[PDB]
Amino acid sequence: QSVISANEIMDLLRGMDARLQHLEQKVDKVLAQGSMVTQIKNELSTVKTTLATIEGMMATV
Amino acid sequence: QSVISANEIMDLLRGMDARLQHLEQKVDKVLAQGSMVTQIKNELSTVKTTLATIEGMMATV
Amino acid sequence: VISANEIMDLLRGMDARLQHLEQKVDKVLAQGSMVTQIKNELSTVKTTLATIEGMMATVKIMD
Amino acid sequence: VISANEIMDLLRGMDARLQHLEQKVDKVLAQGSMVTQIKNELSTVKTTLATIEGMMATVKIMD
To answer: Which residues form a coiled coil (chains A, B) (predicted)?
Structure first.
């Protein structure tokens, strides 16, 4: 024992390191997803401005 | 006609304004979702640091 | 020149696309229930690991 | 003092929670297909509306 126990604990820790690295790769992908939600928000602002111009047009024939 | 057509077009435009405002409220909510993905990413960094300390501990008994 | 009827048709098309966009945004939103769970579960892991680190450490303290 | 076995049990618990976290992150990721569609569909609406604005406007130009 003694060294055996520490080796077995170390094996759990390394397996968890690997999980964490996989989680980080996945979460990075979700973050990239978020950056286009940010672009979607921008596009919305632009669409509103365009509608308002068209509305001004329609109001004056 | 003439004024009728412009009124009918204006009705479409206003309906689209309302849709845009609803879309903005929803997209704002997705953006808030994203801000906790950002917190999740942070928590991951911290967990890794904690595992590394525990690993140092286990390496020296 | 463009006709009023053609304008109405194009706007009606746009309005349909916005609605369909809206439906998809709704489905993404419905995932929030999940992102919150992820945050809370990860937070539990974080706190627990840090606690374990502390339990393992030898602390010397006097009265 | 804490025992090696107790440490192994707690770590095994944490490892299970990470896995379950991972499953949930995977489900959120699978939504990307949807966020991209939203971006592309909104972009079409944006471009089309701006185009319509231009079609409606009277433009004077000479050779």
So the answer is: 6-33
